[PDB]
Symmetry: none
Subunit: 76 residues, 2 copies
């Protein structure tokens, strides 16, 4: 047989294309997944900061609220 030989050949070329595709997708997918993971981790650290900063700001007003009540009670 010949023509089978050329199909063989083409199938092997096809197989090579597909295995190359898997490796590419595997590696590119893993990359995208890892940078997304890094970003959410970065966002978690940013959040904790903002929550700290925000906790401090809110307590400041509570403190001021009490200081104001105290002042006005000095003539109540």
């Amino acid at each position: 047989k010949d023509e089978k030989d050329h199909l063989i050949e083409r199938l092997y070329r096809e197989i090579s294309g597909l295995k190359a595709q898997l490796e590419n997708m595997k590696t590119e997918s893993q990359r995208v997944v890892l940078q997304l993971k890094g970003h959410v981790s970065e966002l978690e650290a940013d959040l904790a900061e903002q929550q700290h900063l925000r906790q401090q700001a809110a307590d400041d007003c509570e403190f001021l609220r009490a200081e104001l009540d105290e002042l006005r009670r000095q003539r109540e």
Copy 2:
């Protein structure tokens, strides 16, 4: 004979390998889309929570501004 069946045999094996390879590709991209989608959703929820923290930070700042302006003036009015 001339080698006809042996080539038909291999051709079949190569058909099977190709089909296995395309099933892998499908299963990989389906799995990947699934993970990426969940990560992107987490990102935007985290971003939403960052946005709300700034809103409340701003609100506390305006509140302090008000409180401090009240304090300053009530004393001002009393020093007369």
